[PDB]
């Protein structure tokens, strides 16, 4: 019964992303900044190779259990810490624990579900845990912040974090270090492969699109359309709901459609949607492009996550910690320098021109995905 491992990875991703999306609106309010926001992604980017090597020395369960212990301490510190230095330390600890959870859980899903289609299906659900977490983070945080108090959301998360830990002690039960069998291809060998580079680049550019869109779209809104406070929250809501739907459907569906074709169509759709965003004049005109952006990024992510495991299964040694380190690096590159570069370029040349540049880059990189098809 490997469904318990799937449940634990689903819950770990869900709770990690709930914490990630809950800490966002509260802290500026609690403190009343870019380095604090980017510290999690930077630390995760730095420690991804080390976790990729460590899971090959001691196994997956011990790094996964430590992810809960660091997550529990990070959650407890988040509840009581009121200093910027301690918030930064907690954020970086969350980065280390999220690196452990992401890399080791994706590796254990890939090593437990070795089927090519079941792997896509179960990473569809697991990434759907991430989508559900990003969906219900802000609402849960806001309601429990208004009703009970500032530290109430952190304590409830801490209770389920402990409960995930009890199942983790019951079945993961990592009493002792057990070494893996075979040595993975060095990271340098992995980084010379052009197709792994193309897959990572597609993930990086598609995700950097949304990473620079999400904090810069309201900046355009308050100056052009003068939207009210709730409209900003509801404007990006179709993106999140469509990301949930796209992840859950396309984890199942992209194998039949074709992962290369699904990625290419997602790249074109996100490029055209980003190109059409500057033409919109009101929220009803933004419902369709945001839905398309989220839908297409769901296609791309749910099609390129299993392809990273497929690439090493085809070309290299089948150890997944180190290649999912690269896959997570692709995300962290977009999510680390995203807001800063987006703001800088928007101030320099303009927001519509920035989005046109993103669309052109996406559209021109889309033909590169043609090489990802299987030779037969």
d(CA 157, CA 209): 30
Query: Which residue of 60, 65, 220, 243 would you call a contact of ligand WRF, by CB under 6 A?
Result: 243
Q: Is 239 in the site for ligand WRF (CB under 6 A)?
A: yes
Find out whether 233 and 137 touch, Cβ atoms under 8 Å.
no
Which of 78, 331, 351, 365 forms a contact with ligand WRF (CB under 6 A)?
A: 331
Cβ nearer to ligand WRF, comparing 56 with 94: 94
* 173 SS3 class: coil
With b meaning 16 or more CB within 10 Å and e meaning fewer, what string describes 347-367?
eeeebeebbbebbebbbebbe
Q: Which is nearer to ligand WRF, 172 or 239 (CB)?
A: 239
Please count the other Cβ atoms lying within 10 Å of the Cβ belonging to residue 268. Answer: 17
5 is in an annotated binding site: no
- CB-wise, 74 or 302, nearer to ligand WRF? 302
Structure tokens at 97: 């624990």
Q: x/- string (CB under 6 A) for ligand WRF, residues 196-215?
A: -----------x--x-----
What mask, x for binding ligand WRF by CB under 6 A, covers residues 286 to 315? --------x--x---x--------------
Q: Is 48 in the site for ligand WRF (CB under 6 A)?
A: no
| Position closest to ligand WRF via CB | 243
Contact 160, 15 (CB under 8 A): yes
Rounded least distance, CB 166 to ligand WRF, Å:
28
Residue with tokens 């190109």: 275
Is 134 near ligand WRF (CB under 6 A)? yes
- To the question of whether residue 335 is assigned a binding role by annotation, the answer is yes
Give the total residue count for the chain.
376
Smallest distance, ligand WRF to C-beta of residue 198, A: 19
Nearest to 166 by CA among 364, 343, 7, 27: 7
207 known member of a binding site = yes
Is the CB of residue 260 less than 8 Å from the CB of residue 373?
Answer: yes
| Residues contacting residue 105 through CB under 8 Å, at least 6 positions apart | 8, 9, 12, 13, 60, 64, 67, 126
Q: How many C-beta atoms surround the C-beta of residue 191 within 10 A?
A: 12
Which one, 48 or 240, has the nearer CB to ligand WRF? 240
User: Which of residues 92, 99, 240, 322 is near ligand WRF by CB under 6 A?
Assistant: 240
- Annotated binding residues, written as ranges, equal 130, 134, 207, 210, 214, 236, 243, 301, 335
Residues near ligand WRF (CB under 6 A):
130, 134, 207, 210, 239-240, 243, 294, 297, 301, 331
């Amino acid at each position: 019964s490997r469904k318990l491992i799937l449940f634990i990875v689903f819950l770990a991703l869900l709770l990690d992303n709930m914490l990630l999306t809950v800490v966002v609106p509260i802290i500026p309010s609690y403190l009343y900044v870019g380095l604090l926001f980017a510290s999690k992604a930077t630390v995760q980017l730095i420690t991804n190779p080390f976790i990729g090597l460590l899971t090959n020395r001691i196994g997956y369960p011990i790094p996964i259990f430590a992810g809960f212990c660091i997550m529990f301490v990070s959650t407890i510190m988040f509840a009581f810490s009121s200093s910027y230095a301690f918030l930064l330390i907690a954020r970086s600890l969350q980065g280390i624990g999220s690196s452990c959870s992401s890399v080791a859980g994706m590796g254990m899903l890939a090593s437990v579900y070795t089927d090519d289609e079941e792997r896509g299906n179960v990473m569809g659900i697991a990434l759907g845990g991430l989508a559900m977490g990003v969906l219900v983070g802000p609402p849960f945080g806001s309601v429990l912040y208004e009703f009970v108090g500032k530290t109430a959301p952190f304590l409830v998360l801490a209770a389920l974090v402990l409960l995930d830990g009890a199942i983790q002690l019951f079945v993961l039960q990592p009493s002792r270090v057990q070494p893996e069998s075979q040595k993975g291809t060095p990271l340098t060998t992995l980084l010379k492969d052009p197709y792994i580079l193309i897959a990572a680049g597609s993930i990086c550019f598609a995700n950097m699109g949304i990473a620079m869109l999400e904090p810069a779209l309201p900046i355009w809104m308050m100056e052009t359309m003068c939207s009210r406070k709730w409209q900003l929250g509801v404007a990006f809501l179709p993106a999140s709901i469509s990301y949930l739907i796209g992840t859950n459907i396309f984890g199942i569906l992209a194998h039949k459609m074709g992962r290369w074709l699904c990625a290419l169509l997602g790249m074109i759709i996100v490029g055209v949607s980003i190109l059409c965003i500057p033409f919109a004049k009101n929220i009803y005109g933004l419902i369709a492009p945001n839905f398309g952006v989220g839908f297409a990024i769901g296609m791309v992510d749910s099609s390129m996550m299993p392809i990273m495991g497929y690439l090493v299964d085809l070309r290299h040694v089948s150890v997944y910690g180190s290649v999912y380190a690269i896959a997570d690096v692709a995300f962290c590159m977009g999510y680390a320098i995203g807001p800063s570069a987006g703001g800088a370029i928007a101030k320099a040349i303009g927001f519509p021109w920035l989005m046109t540049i993103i669309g052109i880059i996406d559209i021109l990189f889309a033909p590169l995905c043609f090489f990802l098809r299987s030779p037969p």
